[PDB]
Amino acid sequence: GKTKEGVLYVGSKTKEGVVHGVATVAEKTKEQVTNVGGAVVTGVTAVAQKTVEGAGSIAAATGFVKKDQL
Amino acid sequence: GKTKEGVLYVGSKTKEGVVHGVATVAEKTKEQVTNVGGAVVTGVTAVAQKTVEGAGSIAAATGFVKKDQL
Amino acid sequence: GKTKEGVLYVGSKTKEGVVHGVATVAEKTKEQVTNVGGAVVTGVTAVAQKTVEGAGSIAAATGFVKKDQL
Amino acid sequence: XXXXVXX
Amino acid sequence: XXXXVXX
Amino acid sequence: XXXXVXX
């Protein structure tokens, strides 16, 4: 009689992998992402909601701002 | 008779992996991410909600701001 | 008759991994992240809520601000 | 930038 | 930047 | 920046 109610998971779950060789070169590059079996999570809003015979309200906001004045 | 109610997980879970060689070079690069079996979580808002015969309210906000004036 | 109610986990759980060689070079680079089986969590707001025959309210906020005036 | 892996 | 791994 | 690992 399992219940998962009002639960969240953010990130990564790994079971029993292998990764041999991951070589990477970034030269004179603005942005570079090398991801292997990983989660790179940026600037997300996620809402899960269940209501039963009730009232439920959520207000969620994310502001991600990045400036690079050179 | 398990219950998970009102629970959250953020980050990473690893069971029994291998990672042999992860070499990386960043030269004259603004941003560089090398992720292997990992979670790189930045600027997230996550809301999970269950209400039953009740009233439930949530207000959540995240502000991520990064400035680099050169 | 297990219950997890009102519980949170933030960070990392590892069981029985291996990581042989993780070499990294950052030269003249603004930002650099090398993550292996790890959680790098920054600027997150996470809310999990379960209400039953009750009233529940949450207000959560995160402000992350980073300035580098050169 | 000579990243030379050799397992 | 000569990252030379050699297992 | 000569990071030379050698297992």
Numbering used by the authors:
A (entry chain A), B (entry chain A), C (entry chain A): 31 to 100
D (entry chain C), E (entry chain C), F (entry chain C): 1 to 7
Task: Show passages lifted from the paper.
α-Synuclein is a 140-amino acid protein, over half of which (residues 7-87) consists of seven imperfect repeats, which are lipid-binding domains. Neuropathologically, it is characterised by the presence of abundant filamentous inclusions of α-synuclein in the form of Lewy bodies and Lewy neurites in some brain cells, including dopaminergic nerve cells of the substantia nigra.
Here we report that the cryo-EM structures of α-synuclein filaments from the brains of individuals with PD, PDD and DLB are made of a single protofilament (Lewy fold) that is markedly different from the protofilaments of MSA. Still, for each case, a minority of filaments (~25%) was twisted, allowing their structure determination by helical reconstruction. α-Synuclein filaments from PD, PDD and DLB are identical and comprise a single protofilament. We termed the structure of the ordered core of these filaments “Lewy fold”. The reconstruction with the highest resolution, 2.2 Å for case 1 of PDD, showed density for main-chain oxygen atoms, establishing that α-synuclein filaments with the Lewy fold have a right-handed twist, in contrast to the left-handed twist observed for α-synuclein filaments with the MSA fold. The third layer consists only of β9. Two additional, partial layers are made by densities (islands) that are not connected to the rest of the ordered core. Island A packs against β5; island B packs against the N-terminal half of β9.
